[PDB]
């Protein structure tokens, strides 16, 4: 409350901690589905149904642009591109088990590198 915080939490890295994710979830080869954002024209069904979308190239844009208040911003827009991608595709898909497998991927960095 006024005049009276918990000790300070070092954020200072967590610019670059972020960014370090991010290069090592555009690196997977199961990445492919989720490296730019789906084409709206192209893909019947997508734009009326996900009303975020959300892909790897605009979460770097956002990123290296200052448009991250916090660490916790990030992670949202991060499980937004598997919940997206679970929405839109059946589990018993190539598509579907990629999601499924990066975000495996990505929560276990998160905990390691922050909790």
């Not at 956002?62 to 679970?86: H, I, M, W």
Request: glycine share 4%.
């Amino acid at each position: 409350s006024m005049s009276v915080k918990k000790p300070k939490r070092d954020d200072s890295k967590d610019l670059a901690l972020c960014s370090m994710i991010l290069t090592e979830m555009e690196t997977h080869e199961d990445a492919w589905p989720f490296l730019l954002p789906v084409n709206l024209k192209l893909v019947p069904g997508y734009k009326k149904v996900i009303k975020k979308p959300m892909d790897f190239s605009t979460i770097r844009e956002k990123l290296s642009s200052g448009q991250y208040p916090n660490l916790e911003t990030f992670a949202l827009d991060v499980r937004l591109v598997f919940d997206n991608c679970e929405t839109f595709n059946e589990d018993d898909s190539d598509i579907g088990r990629a999601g499924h497998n990066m975000r495996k991927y990505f929560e276990k960095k998160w905990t390691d590198t922050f909790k």
